[PDB]
């Protein structure tokens, strides 16, 4: 029974490595690359992998590993795919701490935008979390931390991380994660999931994927939001992008509304994130 080697880059940044049957559904690795990391709670979590026009992509779980990779590398990132929208909820320490090192990827990336403060602050929740109480003997007035904070690191963001963190003398690592998350979860980005496309007239937007609903960045100026309940139908064709808008009250027709996007699979693969998202955050 030939096994196929696959490569997982975890949130820690190391390298998990397993064998799977080629004909193996991506259900098989993901449950392999769980119970390496102790998960539980694995409904929020995915693969992704980068397809032939390096975009990524989600391993779909019900299908072959093969039939979606293709022609690629059995490479793959583990990662958050379903952000909960109150990080309290979860039932253990372990998924918050993932869901932590996720978010502190989305904020040195930059897909996550974030305040001077609240990079300051986070990154006194993860210093707290990882080396315990603030020791002095450690920092002195030329400290920077090996800890990745924010997209661009300045002197001044590592002094306010060691200023809040002197703060938090006898927070237990559950706790300052939950500090953590507790300020993230309201970051106007938090687990939004952009998508560059045009909306009927051509004009270059950004569709945004989360559990509150569908959001249109037209810019900063005029966001438009569409809430998961509204929506009735998601589908694609060629190139485009439509969804089905419920009737107002006491209107007589239901309203479709068109983006057009880079190309088709890109479209799909909106199409498939948005009906993922619809599912996701109506059922609990
Ligand atoms: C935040 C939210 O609002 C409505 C539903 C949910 C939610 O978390 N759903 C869910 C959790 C775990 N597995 C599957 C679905």
């Known amino acids: 029974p030939k096994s196929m080697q696959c490569k997982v880059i975890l949130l820690d940044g190391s390298?998990?490595?397993?064998?799977?049957?080629?004909?193996?559904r991506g259900q098989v690795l993901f449950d392999?690359?769980?119970?390496?990391?102790?998960?539980?709670?694995?409904?929020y979590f995915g693969l992704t992998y980068?397809?032939?026009?390096?975009?990524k992509n989600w391993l779909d779980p019900a299908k072959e590993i093969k039939k979606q990779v293709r022609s690629g590398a059995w490479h793959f990132s583990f990662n958050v795919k379903f952000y909960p929208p109150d990080p309290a909820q979860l039932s253990e320490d372990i998924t918050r701490y993932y869901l932590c090192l996720q978010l502190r990827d989305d904020i040195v990336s930059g897909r996550l935008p974030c305040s001077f403060v609240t990079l300051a602050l986070l990154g006194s929740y993860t210093v707290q979390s990882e080396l315990?109480?603030?020791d002095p003997d450690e920092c002195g007035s030329d400290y920077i931390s090996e800890f990745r904070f924010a997209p661009n690191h300045?002197?001044?963001?590592?002094?306010?991380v060691i200023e809040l963190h002197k703060s938090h003398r006898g927070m237990t690592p559950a706790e300052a994660e939950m500090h953590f998350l507790e300020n993230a979860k309201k970051l106007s980005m938090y687990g939004v999931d952009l998508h560059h496309a045009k909306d009927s007239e051509g004009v270059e937007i950004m569709l945004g994927?989360?559990?509150?609903?569908?959001?249109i960045y037209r810019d900063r100026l005029r966001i438009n939001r569409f809430a998961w309940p509204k929506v009735l139908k998601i589908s694609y064709k060629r190139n485009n992008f439509y969804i089905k808008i419920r009737p107002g009250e006491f209107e007589q027709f239901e309203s479709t509304i068109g983006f057009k996007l880079p190309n088709?699979?890109?479209?799909?693969?909106?199409?498939?994130?948005?009906?993922?998202?619809?599912?996701?955050?109506?059922?609990?």
Do not use: I, M, P
């Open 132 to 134: 315990g109480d603030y």
């Open 50 to 55: 980068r397809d032939a026009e390096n975009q």
């Open 32 to 43: 392999k690359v769980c119970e390496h990391l102790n998960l539980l709670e694995k409904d």
């Open 264 to 284: 088709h699979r890109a479209a799909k693969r909106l199409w498939k994130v948005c009906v993922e998202h619809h599912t996701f955050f109506r059922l609990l």
């Open 154 to 160: 300045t002197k001044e963001l590592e002094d306010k």
């Open 209 to 215: 994927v989360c559990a509150s609903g569908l959001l």
């Open 15 to 24: 390298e998990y490595t397993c064998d799977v049957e080629k004909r193996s």
